[PDB]
């Protein structure tokens, strides 16, 4: 049994430094990798990426402008912050864990392997919309 | 001939997909073929 709680003001003004929080359930953040998924209403989901402390802070290559992810070990909380929200940001978000996976197709010393990630579990999520 | 020769659009490392501006088979009307090197 895994459950989690999110937050959000519901109505967000344009051009505002929106902040989103996601908590954990039992598993500590040090020994786990988290990921965020953004899905437009009725369309295919979009993967923001994965964030982890101590180096593994890779973000979405396409956006790479205003995304900011931070972690709070004391509070066991992970925060997602966006600066300058637009009208196209109205979508459902999901914070969930992920698991690694390895495959080798060449020489062990010539970097013929890529790590592939799959999300065993998915979060409940919270609705975020922008209006006037 | 000097090759209008650029990066690779994936093939990588020493592969440098490249263009020729060849001489064609009808002894005229040069055509801009390409191949790898």
């Amino acid at each position: 049994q895994v459950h989690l709680q999110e937050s959000g003001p519901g109505l967000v003004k344009p051009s505002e430094t929106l902040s989103l929080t996601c908590n954990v359930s039992g598993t500590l953040v040090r020994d786990n990798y988290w990921s965020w998924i953004r899905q437009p209403l009725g369309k295919q989901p979009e993967w923001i990426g994965y964030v982890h402390d101590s180096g593994d802070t890779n973000y979405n290559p396409s956006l790479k402008s205003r995304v900011h992810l931070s972690l709070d070990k004391s509070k066991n909380l992970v925060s997602l912050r966006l600066t300058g929200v637009t009208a196209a940001d109205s979508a459902i978000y999901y914070c969930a864990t992920t698991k690694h996976g390895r495959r080798i197709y060449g020489v062990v010393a010539f970097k013929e392997w890529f790590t592939y990630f799959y999300m065993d579990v998915w979060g409940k999520g919270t609705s975020v919309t922008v209006s006037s | 001939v000097t090759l209008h020769c650029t990066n690779v659009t994936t093939m990588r490392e020493e592969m440098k997909n490249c263009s020729f501006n060849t001489t064609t088979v009808i002894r005229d009307k040069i055509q801009k073929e390409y191949a790898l090197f």
Partner: protein, 105 residues
Amino acid sequence: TFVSVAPGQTARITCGEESLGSRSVIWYQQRPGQAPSLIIYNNNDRPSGIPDRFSGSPGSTFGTTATLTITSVEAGDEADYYCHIWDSRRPTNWVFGEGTTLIVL
């Protein structure tokens, strides 16, 4: 991208582009009003909690397209299926493919 199959019959789902290189396909499903889940976590390996009915193609194919075969369609298969390709040619793609919605009469 809507597929109509009568219950109890066989179904085929086509997703992804041509197989230039090797893949490690991951299969996902979306339920209306419920959180997603997982079905297949590798090219052919599957997790616990599901029988061996689900099948998939290996990643050693060149020039083909990833496909999913489903037989004995039940009422619980009414969900949107998504495919996630993992190619060594292109970088990691963060956008999923054209989701196929399975509807049962």
